[PDB]
Each structure stands twice: as C-alpha cells, then as structure tokens.
Design a binder for this molecule. Structure first.
Ligand SMILES: CCCCCCCCCCCCCCCCCC(=O)OC[C@H](COP(=O)([O-])OCC(O)COP(=O)([O-])OC[C@@H](COC(=O)CCCCCCCCCCCCCCCCC)OC(=O)CCCCCCCCCCCCCCCCC)OC(=O)CCCCCCCCCCCCCCCCC
Ligand SMILES: CCCCCCCCCCCCCCCCCC(=O)OC[C@H](COP(=O)([O-])OCC(O)COP(=O)([O-])OC[C@@H](COC(=O)CCCCCCCCCCCCCCCCC)OC(=O)CCCCCCCCCCCCCCCCC)OC(=O)CCCCCCCCCCCCCCCCC
Ligand SMILES: CCCCCCCCCCCCCCCCCC(=O)OC[C@H](COP(=O)([O-])OCC[N+](C)(C)C)OC(=O)CCCCCCCCCCCCCCCCC
Ligand SMILES: CCCCCCCCCCCCCCCCCC(=O)OC[C@H](COP(=O)([O-])OCC[N+](C)(C)C)OC(=O)CCCCCCCCCCCCCCCCC
Ligand SMILES: CCCCCCCCCCCCCCCCCC(=O)OC[C@H](COP(=O)(O)OCCN)OC(=O)CCCCCCCCCCCCCCCCC
Ligand SMILES: CCCCCCCCCCCCCCCCCC(=O)OC[C@H](COP(=O)(O)OCCN)OC(=O)CCCCCCCCCCCCCCCCC
Ligand SMILES: CCCCCCCCCCCCCCCCCC(=O)OC[C@H](COP(=O)(O)OCCN)OC(=O)CCCCCCCCCCCCCCCCC
Ligand code: HEC
Ligand code: HEM
Ligand code: HEM
Ligand code: FES
Lengths: 56, 98, 237, 52, 74, 54, 65, 379, 54
C-alpha cells in the first residue's frame, strides 16, 4: 500500500512528521495561492486592473 | 382521568427512553446526596449503572429500543422512602433550632 | 417611503468584483461634474494608482489641479501643482461656505456616501436617475427640486446628470443612465477600497475551510471513536 | 427558607443584633455624609458648617 | 476533584477499541439520517410553536405598520 | 432628545424627525407625542441685541 | 443620443401593475386638483407607480450599458 | 522523579484546568460556546490592540483615524472589521451561553452563575464604550441617549451624568474617557473569567441530563480539546464569512457619518445585541421605571437560581418547561425586532406585550410550571 | 509681582513671544479680578469662526 510506505518513511518519527508538515506548507502556499488567484481572476475576467492595464 | 394525564406525561418526559427510573433524574441537593449515600449497596449499584448507561446514550445521542423502556407501572420508587426520612430529620433539626 | 430597487451590479455577486473600467469612468464623472460642489477628502490621488489609473496618469491628473501647501520662507500661504500624494481638493474652504453657497445646504461628503445611506449604490443611483416633476398637490419651496427617493422628498441638489454631460475618453455614450452607473460604481469603490481584495480573501477562506473543517471533524471523530464505540456491561453478583 | 428563619429564638437573635446593626447603619450614614460632603446635612452641624 | 476519588462504582465492565482499528464515520448516513429525523421529530412540537407565533406576529405587525402609514380618505 | 428641524412642520414651528413630535415656534407643543414644551434657558439681555444665554 | 433608461421606461410602464397605478394616480390627480383647497398631494400613488416601474426596470436596463 | 506536567506549579494549574480535569462524558455541543467565548475574548483583546495602535481619541481625529485604519494601514481593514463583527460573535456566544445555563439548570452553581452575571454586565458596558469610540452619528447619538438615562436616577442622577460626560454633553472629554475605559475593562473581564473557571472547577460541569456524572467522567485533553478546536473552527467560519463577505451587515450605515451634534440621524438605535433591552426601556413611559426595568432585565439572572422549584435540575425531562423556555427565546427575539422599529403603532403595544411576557415567563410561569411539573410525577 | 509681570509681558514681550497655553481666564483669582480680566480680554481682537457667509 502507498499509505503504509508513506507512513513508515515520513509519519513514524514525529521529527520527520514535522518536516513533512513544513515542506507541505511551503508547497501548499504556492499551489493554493495560484489556484485561488486563477479562480478569482477567471470569474472576474476582464474587470480587474490586470486585464485592462494593457490598454493604457 | 388524571392518571391518564400522568401516564402521558411520563411518556413525554423522555427519561424512560434512557432506561432511567424516576428517582435517577432528581437533582442532587444535600438532602438527596445524603439519601443516595443511605441507599443499600444493591440499589446503589443499579442506580450508578443506570445513570452511566443513560449518560453514554446521551453522549451518542441515542435511546434504547422500545422494549427496554421503563414502563410507567414498573417505575419503582426506591429513593422515595430514604429521601422522605432525610427530609423528616432535617425538618426536625430546623424545628428544634427554631 | 420609496426604497431603492436592487439593481444587478456587476459586483453584487458573492465573488464578483468591481468593473475597473467603470471605476475609471466614474472618477472622470466625479472630477468633471460633482467635484465643483462635493468633497471626497478621505481619498487621495495615490489611491487611484493601479485600481483604475496608472502611475503616470494619476500624476498628470494631480498636476492638472492646484492645491494649497504650507507657508513659504516669508510665512505666506501659496498655491502649487498637486502631486500623487495630495488628497482630493475640497471645493469649499469651510463647510459653512458650502451651505451658504448652494442654498443653506451642505453637500454631503461622497467618500463614504455609499455606506452612509441605507440602500447603498441602489439608492444613490435611484437618487440621480429619479428626478421627476412634482405630483399634483405638492407645493415645493422655491430653490428645491423634487426627488422621491430622497427622504424628505425634496432634494436641495440640482439635477446633475443630463445627457452628453461629459465626454468619456473610451468613447462610450455619456447617456444619463450610463454616467450614473459609472459614478455609482466609483462611489462604491471610494466607500470600500477593499471590495476587490475582500472577495479574494473570502474565496480563499471558502475553498480552504471547505477542507479544513471536514479534516478537523475527522480528527474529532477519530479521537472520540474510543468512547462512541464503548460497550457497557453490568455484571452484579 | 423563610419558614425556617421565622422563629422565637430567631426574632430574639434579631433583637440582640438590633443595636449593633442599627448603629452600624448610623456609622454608614455618617461616613456617607462625610465622604460625599453632603451639604444638605452638614449645614446643620454647628462647627462643620462653617467650612461652607 | 481528580480522577481516583470521584465516586464508588462496582460490577461494571466497559469494552473499548483503538481509534486506529475502527472507522471514524461508521454509517454516517445509514443511521445518521434516521437518528436525526427522530431527534427533530421528538423536539419540533416543543421548539416550533413559539417561533411560528413570532413569525405571525412579525408579519402582522409589519403589514399593520405598512397599511397604517398610508393616507386616510378624508 | 432628537433635535427638531428649523421653523417648519405641520403648523410651522418644529418637526422632530425621530418620532414625529410637534412644537410651535415657541417651544410649545401643538401636535405629536411631544410630552411637554421645550425648556427655556436662563437668558440674560444685554444692551442692543447681544443676549448672553445662560 | 437617446437614453437606454428612457427607452426601458415606457416598456416597463406597459405593465399591468404599472397600468393600474396609472389610473389610480390619474384619479388622485383629478380629486386633488379639482377641489379648490385640499391637502390630500398624490405622493402615495406616485410612490406605488414608481415602485412598480423601478422594480421592473431594475431587472432590465443594466443589460444595455 | 515526576511529571513536570503535574508537579511544576504553572503546569499543575494548567493540567488541573484543561488537561486532566474530569469532564462529563455526555457534554453536548452547547458547552463549546464557553471556550468560544474565551477565544472571542482573546481575539477581541488581540485585534483591539492593533486598533489602539492606529486610533487617536480626539474628536477632531477619531473618525479620520478610523478611516485611516480602514483605507491606509496595510491590512488594517481586516483588523477593523474583525473587531466590529467579533463583537457580534462575542455577544451571540454570550447569549447562547446564558441560554444553555438557563436551560440545563446550570445556575445551581451559584458562584459561577453570579460571576457570569457580573461578566455579562462588564461585557455589555465594554461593548457600549467601544461602539462609542469610532465617533459616528450612531456612536455619538446612542451614547447621548444611553447616558441620559442616568438623569432619571433621583437626587444624584443629574450630577452622575455630568460626571460621566465629563462636562455638559458627550464631547471631547467623554471620547477619551470611554477610550481609556474600553481599554482597561477587557482585562478585568479576563480576571473575572479566570475566577469563573476556578469556581466552576470547584464543582465540575453539568451534563445535559442534569444528573451528577461522577461515574462517567473522561479526561479533558484527548477529547474536549479537539472538540473545542472544532467549535473554534466553526465560529471562525461564521466570523470570517461575516467579515470578508458582508462586513456592514450587522452595523448601521449612519455610523459612517462624522458625528454632528446639531443634527440627528432619522433613527437612533443601539447595536443589535442591545435592542432586546432597549425595547424594554421603551415599554414604560415612566423614565425612572424604564431605567429600573432596564437594569432588572439583566439582574433577573441573579434571582433565577432562587426561582428554581422543579425537583429535576435541567429541562431535558420537562416538556412544559421546554415550551416555556422557547416562549422566552421567541419573546427575546420579538423584543430585539421591536427595538429596531420606531415608536409607532403597532410596535408600541407589541413592545409592551413582549416586555410584560418576558418577566411573566421568568418570574411566574416557570415556577408555577415546575410546581405542576413535580405534581405530575408523584413528587 | 505676578500682576505686574503680566503687564510687563503685555506691553513688551507680547510683541514677539506667546503663551498660547495660557488664557485670560487663568488670570482670574491669581493676579486680576473677574471684571479686570474681562476688560483685559476685550482690549484685543481675536479671529473667530466662519460667519453665515463662511
Ligand atoms: C454561534 C454559531 C457558530 C459556532 C457554533 C459552534 C458550536 C460547536 C460546533 C463544533 C462542535 O463541537 O460540534 C459538536 C457537534 C456534535 O459532534 P458530532 O460528531 O457531530 O456528533 C454526532 C453524533 O454523535 C451522532 O449524530 P447522529 O446520530 O445524528 O449521526 C451523525 C449526524 C447525522 O448524519 C448526517 O449526515 C447529518 C445529516 C445530513 O448527526 C450529527 O450531528 C453530525 C453532524 C451533522 C452536521 O457537531 C455537530 O453537531 C455538527 C457540527 C456543529 C455545527 C453545525 C450544526 C448543524
Ligand atoms: C432535521 C432538520 C433540522 C435540524 C436542526 C433542527 C433540529 O431539530 O435539530 C435536532 C437536533 C439537535 O437537537 P437534539 O439533538 O434534539 O438535542 C441535543 C442538542 O441539540 C445538542 O446536540 P449536539 O450537541 O449534537 O448539537 C447539535 C446541534 C449543534 O448546534 C450547535 O452547534 C449550535 C447552533 C449553531 C450551529 O445541531 C443543530 O442542528 C442544533 C442547533 C441548530 C438548529 C437549527 O439536530 C439534529 O437532529 C441534526 C443536527 C445537524 C444538522 C443536520
Ligand atoms: C486563536 C483562535 C483560535 C484559532 C483556531 C484554533 C484551532 C485551529 C488550530 C488547531 C488545529 C488542530 C490541531 C493541529 C495540530 C495537530 O495536528 O496537532 C496534533 C499533532 C499530533 O497528532 P498525532 O499524534 O495524530 O500524530 C503525531 C504522532 N506520530 C508522529 C506518531 C504520527 O501534533 C503534531 O504533530 C506536532 C508536531 C508537528 C507540528 C508542529 C511542528 C511543525 C509546525 C509547522 C512548521 C513550522 C512552523
Ligand atoms: C445620596 C448621597 C448624597 C448625595 C449628594 O448629592 O450629596 C450631596 C453632595 C453635594 O451636593 P449638594 O449638597 O451641594 O447638593 C445635593 C443635591 N444635588 C446633588 C441634587 C444638587 O453630593 C456630592 O458631593 C456628590 C453626589 C453624588 C455622589 C453620591
Ligand atoms: C484559524 C483562523 C484561520 C481560519 C482559516 C482561514 C483561511 C483563509 C485564509 O487565511 O486565506 C488567506 C487570506 C489572505 O490571502 P491573500 O490576501 O491572498 O494573502 C496571502 C497571499 N499573499 O487570509 C486572510 O484573509 C487572513 C486570515 C483569516 C482572518 C484572520 C484569522 C485569524 C484571526
Ligand atoms: C460526511 C462525510 C465526510 C466527512 C469528512 C471526511 C474527512 C476525511 C476522512 C474521510 O474521507 O472519511 C470518510 C471515509 C471513512 O473514514 P473512516 O470512517 O475513518 O474509515 C476509514 C477506512 N475506510 O474515508 C474515505 O472516504 C477515505 C478512505 C476510504
Ligand atoms: C437550537 C434549536 C434546536 C433545539 O433546541 O432543539 C431542541 C433540542 C433538545 O435538546 P435535548 O437536550 O435533547 O432536550 C430534551 C429532549 N427530551 O436542543 C435544545 O433544547 C438545545 C437548545 C436549548 C438549550 C441551549 C440554549 C439555546 C439558547 C438559544 C437562544 C439564546 C437567547 C435566549 C436565551 C438567553
Ligand atoms: C451645484 C450643486 C450640486 C451639484 C452639481 C451636485 N450636487 Fe449633490 N448635493 C448638493 C446639495 C446642496 C445637497 C444636499 C441636499 C439635501 O441636503 C446634495 C446631496 C447629494 C447626496 C446626498 C443625498 C441624500 O440622500 O442626502 C449625494 C449622494 C449627492 N449629492 C451626490 C452628487 C453626485 C454623484 C453629483 C454629480 C455626478 C452631484 N451630487 C451634483 C449639491 C450639488
Ligand atoms: C465573559 C464571558 C464568559 C466566559 C469567558 C465564560 C467562560 C466559561 C467557560 C469556558 C465555561 C465552561 C464551558 C461551558 O460550560 O460553557 C463556563 C461555564 C459556565 N458559565 Fe460561563 N463564561 C462567560 C459568561 C457567562 C455568563 C454570562 C454566564 C451566565 C450568567 C455564565 C455562566 C456559566 C455557567 C453556569 C457555567 C457552567 C455551565 C455548566 O456547568 O453546564 N458564563 N464559563
Ligand atoms: C471585551 C472585548 C471587546 C469588545 C466586545 C469590544 C467591542 C468593540 C466595539 C463594538 C467597537 C466598535 C466597533 C465599531 O466601530 O463598529 C470597538 C472599537 C474599538 N475597540 Fe474594542 N472591544 C473589545 C476589546 C478591546 C480591547 C481590549 C481594546 C484595546 C486593546 C479595544 C480597542 C478598541 C478600539 C481602539 C476601538 C476603536 C476602533 C473601531 O471602532 O473600529 N477593544 N470595540
Ligand atoms: S425624539 Fe423628538 S419625537 Fe422622537
């Protein structure tokens, strides 16, 4: 099972657990911010001062 | 008649659904606490288990099946004599202090 | 009294935001129509940068107007071209001069005028596009104008917004309804210089709590399953 | 409650503590007049009224 | 009032299970939904009537205000 | 305590906007809930017109 | 140049509710004007007509700007 | 050789407080609001600090400084609206907490209940002063209307007002005075909350069933810490929805106007969490009677433990008292609705009926219902 | 000496210095009587607020 190997490698030691959490937060910040910004920008396409600044 | 109203109230009260008897639901003031202490061991053990089962059921937000509901006729009155005696003793003490 | 209808603004959506080109037109109508009599001193030309005007454009707008700057070496008040950091000019020196100017009436500050009126933009829009002749029976005092949407049914304002009142640079026809629409969007932005960012943060919160809450719930259920699966037994002698 | 406290010896205790409680109330009244500087009452005491 | 001297209980046996060997959402809908329905059925007759009375009073008062604010033919 | 507007209303004295109390142009009530008359200060006339109010 | 607001105004006034408000207001006009001196002011019927017309025009209009 | 958890003094106090404290097993979700109060308090102590870091207290710079926090301070608007709506969250949790204590007969804990009443009074006063702070139209005029009640007090009353006003009307002095008081008070609230937790721990919590649960007790840490974390997550969800999506939902728009003593707003209403009492104020034409009823509307909670006549403690097994309690809640909601509307027909008569019914339910209907209740169960 | 020093300030030092934190009211009961303070204040002309014309 993927979960078993993942637990043995990462979650067994609380120190590796904290490290996994830290790197997960590091990458999750980028992933989530990119996704949320893309969604918000797509919903309001053509209305923010980034799809129209090119006109000025 | 009145006893029908009382039976309706016992059904609508809800402590029968938890397996509780009437006296298990009473508030534990000083008189009630002393009465509970005065209970014989065999009654006290059943009281404690019934209370603990009821607390478990309320923790899981459930009730016993309809068959194991304390019926109105089967609702014994175990704490009543001891509570009555305790109240009588307290009344005697208050009257003497008067 | 008569309340405002709920117009379908482009920003009335939960995650929707303002139309920034409409904000650009709204600033123009503010500057060339109601800047003569209304003050927006809480906002400054700096705020205009990056929301509906660019840096150089806002600088040119600031240089167009002249403001008062602190006393010189000789201790005399003097004029100077406005820069990007000055607040919007106040058309009247003191509020009393304002009241005495128009007709004993103080034009309310437009900075918060959207959040200072029950109804928000829908009110002020219906205020501007609501002027009409008095109904039979009303004997409106001289110098006042009839506006049903205004509590008191008698505005001291004069009808500001007629057709071809200005020339939008985009080339959109400056018809009355259009001009009022952009002025109201601009007023909403002025009253809420966070509406864009507020909805973005709210969207992040929604799509983030949508996974945080089930996970904390799962942790609670995992910890409590020790008790919720308890099976009691009573074995008296 | 009030059934218990209504007794012969209870009223007798009340009578015993009447003087101390009453002149505790007098203590409170004088202290209130003093701290507040209640001019309405202090205008009648001979020496003190000279302050105003 | 710490664990160890709270009360005196006898002849009770409780069996438990490790949280890592039992599901955290056991039949969350198979018995969740009927339990919810029983819970709301056994309480709606006591909860609803006051709020429904408040709703009637609210709507009556609001429409009374509205049609008392009109003009009286005179 | 809502401050009434200037000389206007039903009769023309006052019109309290909060809950519609009327007062004539003397502080005296003539309409509305308006429990009592408007209360008058301890005015002091100087010469000419510069009344020192209070 | 014509106002889209104005264009939608008569279309919204061509509404049964607006129609009823029209003759209500007109009758009020005759009652008030014909009498020599009256404080009964047709602002109530005007408000009803305006509320109907404006609730109609709110749905329309904005998809023309 | 020992746990520093249960031997170190501070750690021992924390352990007995919320690590190994014996808690009832069947504690329902309604108890979470306890912590949901404290967390709110912490949040209110937190954000308010970051507000006092950009808020002056002069009447020439109060409103301008608030607008400065909203428009110019980096992310300052988040803090400002977080405070403004966390106040409403605090009061929602407070009202639900009082309702829980009333329903399940938790007022039998006399010391904790009285301390809770003191906390309620302190929180209400602090919120009133805080709402005075931003110096809007609502702020100034509500402050004048509320403080002018103290003129009704016989003899000293007028002086008292001139004392609190620091002059002759709510003005420059009162703004700074209320700022200082709004700053100091929440720490007094924190101290009282600590005393409250002490008193409650001397007896232990009460379960929904109302019966002593000394047999089915579970450690606090592994279970109720995560339960409280979930409760805090839900409350943060509601509060963040409020702040991010509809910030000016529970407020009044006229508060966004510079305070002008020469003109009043069309309506003078207080914050929502006060209307329930304000309507009672409006019920009695006698101004002194109005103030007395205003105070009694909260002080009734003090008498509530005395009025308890039912043999049972909670309302779990008292359907008649359950309908009475929900009648009371509907009555409070009715008073809240009445407070907003102006003093006109039929709001006046409805307000009098609601105010009468509130005290009738608390003082008469509930004890008589409990008396009938015991008789219906052989005791 | 305070009373004399105030005159010294008024006629000599006040030409180019100021005590903006001190108002004529403060002089009452320390160096000038109430009517004298009124007379002292009325000898000078001070800016006031806007008129009805701003
Ligand atoms: C102020 C307002 C804002 C803040 C409020 C904060 C309050 C505390 C919230 C957090 C908390 O501790 O909740 C504990 C509290 C009880 O814990 P639980 O694990 O849900 O208990 C399930 C029962 O043991 C067993 O329940 P069951 O037998 O009915 O089966 C499961 C389920 C019914 O199954 C379902 O699927 C629900 C119906 C669909 O019923 C539930 O109550 C589960 C949650 C349903 C939502 O949580 C809830 O009741 C749900 C979340 C609470 C908020 C929403 C309530 C609606
Ligand atoms: C069925 C559709 C209506 C459900 C809500 C009303 C109702 O009858 O609830 C009965 C019942 C709650 O009262 P109960 O179980 O009869 O009595 C125990 C207490 O409520 C305490 O039970 P708990 O500790 O499990 O907390 C459950 C509570 C959680 O309530 C809260 O956390 C506080 C309220 C703000 C959320 O969930 C509620 O829905 C009650 C408050 C909101 C009612 C609307 O909730 C449900 O059956 C399902 C609740 C979850 C939503 C589905
Ligand atoms: C203030 C107002 C209230 C705000 C909201 C409050 C509620 C939300 C916060 C709490 C959420 C739930 C708990 C989250 C933490 C958690 O899982 O704790 C239990 C967990 C333990 O859960 P566990 O015991 O299931 O797993 C650990 C055990 N092994 C190793 C065997 C798997 O705590 C930890 O894991 C602690 C160590 C890791 C975390 C800390 C170090 C890294 C931190 C991030 C990087 C550095 C910055
Ligand atoms: C009640 C206690 C006395 C109150 C009072 O006003 O005492 C008089 C004294 C001095 O007042 P006084 O004696 O000049 O006048 C009393 C009557 N009034 C207040 C209506 C003018 O009160 C105080 O010094 C403070 C009174 C408020 C605090 C108690
Ligand atoms: C526990 C308390 C938090 C609960 C979960 C909140 C999740 C939402 C969240 O924080 O979203 C991110 C948002 C800011 O997002 P953004 O404006 O894009 O800035 C970051 C990228 N530069 O963050 C915010 O808007 C601020 C964080 C939420 C509000 C304060 C919560 C603590 C008080
Ligand atoms: C309401 C349903 C969702 C509640 C919140 C879910 C949070 C994440 C955990 C999860 O997915 O739980 C749902 C389900 C069952 O989880 P559990 O009862 O712990 O059993 C695991 C072993 N089958 O587990 C899964 O669906 C994923 C594993 C299969
Ligand atoms: C919330 C709405 C749903 C609701 O209350 O449903 C009723 C339910 C019953 O709870 P239970 O403990 O099972 O009652 C005994 C049943 N035989 O749940 C309850 O009775 C719980 C709700 C009452 C007790 C908690 C306090 C709630 C207060 C709400 C109003 C607050 C303001 C007014 C009071 C101050
Ligand atoms: C020459 C004078 C003048 C012009 C032009 C003018 N106003 Fe006004 N305005 C006033 C006066 C005076 C009042 C006060 C009416 C009452 O009081 C007022 C009132 C307002 C109000 C508040 C109404 C209320 O409900 O209290 C708003 C909003 C407003 N104006 C916005 C505008 C906008 C937007 C424009 C143009 C795009 C504009 N005004 C043009 C003088 C003017
Ligand atoms: C400052 C706000 C308050 C805080 C921080 C606070 C804190 C707490 C906490 C954390 C608890 C334990 C959790 C719980 O049982 O709910 C609690 C219990 C309690 N509080 Fe409060 N409280 C506050 C206000 C009040 C008020 C206003 C009252 C009522 C007058 C009150 C009465 C009680 C009672 C009776 C309990 C015991 C509940 C029970 O045993 O079932 N509290 N308090
Ligand atoms: C007991 C918890 C508290 C409550 C319930 C509370 C409540 C309030 C309320 C209702 C307002 C008015 C919000 C508005 O303008 O609409 C406010 C403003 C304010 N509070 Fe608090 N407050 C609390 C704690 C604090 C603390 C501890 C501080 C100081 C550190 C503080 C500082 C302020 C400041 C500076 C303002 C003015 C800023 C503003 O109004 O937006 N508050 N508070
Ligand atoms: S305040 Fe003057 S009538 Fe309402």
């Amino acid at each position: 099972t993927l979960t078993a190997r993942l637990y043995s490698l990462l979650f067994r030691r609380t120190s590796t657990f904290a490290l996994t959490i830290a790197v997960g937060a590091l990458f999750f910040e980028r992933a989530f911010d990119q996704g949320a910004d893309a969604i918000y920008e797509h919903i309001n396409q053509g209305k923010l001062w980034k799809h129209i600044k090119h006109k000025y | 008649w009145l006893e029908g109203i009382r039976k309706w109230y016992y059904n609508a009260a809800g402590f029968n659904k938890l397996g509780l008897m009437r006296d298990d639901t009473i508030y534990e003031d000083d008189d009630v606490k002393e009465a509970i202490r005065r209970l014989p061991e065999n009654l006290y053990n059943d009281r404690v288990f019934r209370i603990k089962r009821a607390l478990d059921l309320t923790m899981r937000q459930q009730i016993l099946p309809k068959e194991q509901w304390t019926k109105y006729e089967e609702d014994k009155f175990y704490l009543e004599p001891y509570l009555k005696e305790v109240i009588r003793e307290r009344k005697e003490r208050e009257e003497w202090a008067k | 009294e008569l309340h405002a209808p709920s117009y379908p603004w482009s920003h009335r959506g939960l995650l929707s935001s303002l139309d920034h080109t409409s904000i650009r037109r709204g600033f123009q109508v503010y500057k060339q129509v109601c800047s003569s009599c209304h003050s927006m001193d809480y906002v400054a030309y700096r705020h205009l940068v990056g929301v509906c005007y660019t840096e150089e454009e806002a600088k040119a707008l600031a240089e167009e107007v002249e403001v008062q700057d602190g006393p010189n070496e000789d201790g005399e008040m003097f004029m100077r071209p406005g820069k990007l950091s000055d607040y919007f000019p106040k058309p009247y020196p003191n509020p009393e001069a304002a009241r005495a100017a128009n007709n004993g009436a103080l034009p309310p500050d437009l900075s918060y005028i959207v959040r200072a009126r029950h109804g928000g933009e829908d009110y002020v829009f219906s205020l501007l596009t609501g002027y009409c002749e008095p109904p039979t029976g009303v004997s409106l005092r001289e110098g006042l104008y009839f506006n049903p949407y205004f509590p008191g049914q008698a505005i001291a304002m004069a009808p500001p917004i007629y057709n071809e009142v200005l020339e939008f640079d985009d080339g959109t026809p400056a018809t009355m309804s259009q001009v009022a629409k952009d002025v109201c969007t601009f007023l909403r932005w002025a009253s809420e210089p966070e509406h864009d960012h507020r909805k973005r943060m709210g969207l992040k919160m929604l799509m983030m709590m949508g996974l945080l809450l089930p996970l904390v719930y799962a942790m609670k259920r995992h910890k409590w399953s020790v008790l919720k699966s308890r099976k009691l037994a009573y074995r008296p002698p | 409650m009030l059934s218990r406290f209504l007794g012969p010896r209870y009223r007798e205790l009340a009578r015993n503590w009447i003087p101390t409680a009453s002149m505790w109330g007098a203590v409170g009244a004088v202290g209130l007049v003093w701290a507040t500087d209640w001019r309405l009452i202090l205008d009648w005491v001979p020496y003190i009224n000279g302050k105003f | 009032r710490e664990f160890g001297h709270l009360t005196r209980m006898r002849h009770v046996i409780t069996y438990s299970l490790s949280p890592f060997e039992q599901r955290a959402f056991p039949h969350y809908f198979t018995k969740g939904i009927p339990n919810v329905l029983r819970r709301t059925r056994a309480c709606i007759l006591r909860v609803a009537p006051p709020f429904v009375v408040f709703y009637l009073v609210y709507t009556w008062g609001t429409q009374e205000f509205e049609k008392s604010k009109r003009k009286n033919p005179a | 305590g809502c401050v009434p507007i200037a000389n206007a209303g039903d009769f023309g004295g006052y019109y309290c906007p909060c809950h519609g109390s009327h007062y004539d142009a003397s502080g005296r009530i003539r309409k509305g809930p308006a429990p009592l008359n408007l209360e008058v200060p301890t005015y002091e006339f100087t010469s000419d017109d510069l009344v020192i109010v209070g | 140049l014509v106002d889209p607001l104005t264009t939608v105004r008569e279309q919204c006034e061509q509404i049964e509710k607006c129609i009823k408000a029209r003759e209500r207001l007109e009758l009020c006009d005759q009652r008030v004007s014909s009498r020599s001196q009256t404080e009964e002011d047709c602002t109530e019927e005007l408000f009803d007509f305006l509320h109907a017309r404006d609730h109609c025009v709110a749905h329309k209009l904005f998809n023309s700007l | 050789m020992t746990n520093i958890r249960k031997s170190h003094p501070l750690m021992k106090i924390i352990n007995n407080a919320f690590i190994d404290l014996p808690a009832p097993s069947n504690i329902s979700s309604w108890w979470n609001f306890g912590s949901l109060l404290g967390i709110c308090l912490i949040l209110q102590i937190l954000t308010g600090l970051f507000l006092a870091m950009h808020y002056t207290s002069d009447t020439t710079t109060a409103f301008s400084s608030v607008t400065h926090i909203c428009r110019d301070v980096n992310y300052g608007w988040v803090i400002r609206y977080l405070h403004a709506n966390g106040a409403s969250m605090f009061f929602i949790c407070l009202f639900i907490h009082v309702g829980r204590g009333l329903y399940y007969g938790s007022y039998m804990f006399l010391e904790t209940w009285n301390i809770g009443v003191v906390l309620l009074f302190t929180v209400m006063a602090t919120a009133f002063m805080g709402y005075v702070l931003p110096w809007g139209q609502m702020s100034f005029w509500g402050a004048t209307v509320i403080t002018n009640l103290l003129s009704a007090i016989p003899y000293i009353g007028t002086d008292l007002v001139e004392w609190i006003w620091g002059g002759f009307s709510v003005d420059k002095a009162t703004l700074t005075r209320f700022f200082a008081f709004h700053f100091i008070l929440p720490f007094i609230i924190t101290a009282l909350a600590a005393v409250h937790l002490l008193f409650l721990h001397e007896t232990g919590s009460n379960n929904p069933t109302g019966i002593s649960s000394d047999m089915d007790k579970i450690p606090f840490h592994p279970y109720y810490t995560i339960k409280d974390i979930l409760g805090a997550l839900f409350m943060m969800l509601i509060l963040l929805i409020l702040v991010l999506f509809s910030p000016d939902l529970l407020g009044d728009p006229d508060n966004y106007t510079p305070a002008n003593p020469l003109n009043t707003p069309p309506h003078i209403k207080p914050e929502w969490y006060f209307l329930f009492a304000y309507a009672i104020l409006r019920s009695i034409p006698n101004k002194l009677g109005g103030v007395l009823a205003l105070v009694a509307s909260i002080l009734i909670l003090i008498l509530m433990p005395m009025l308890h006549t039912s043999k049972q403690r909670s309302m779990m097994f008292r359907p008649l008292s359950q309908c009475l309690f929900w009648m009371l809640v509907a009555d409070l909601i009715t008073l809240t609705w009445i407070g907003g509307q102006p003093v006109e027909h039929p709001f006046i008569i409805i307000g009098q009926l609601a105010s009468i019914l509130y005290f009738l339910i608390i003082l008469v209907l509930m004890p008589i219902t409990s008396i009938i209740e015991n008789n219906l169960l052989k005791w």
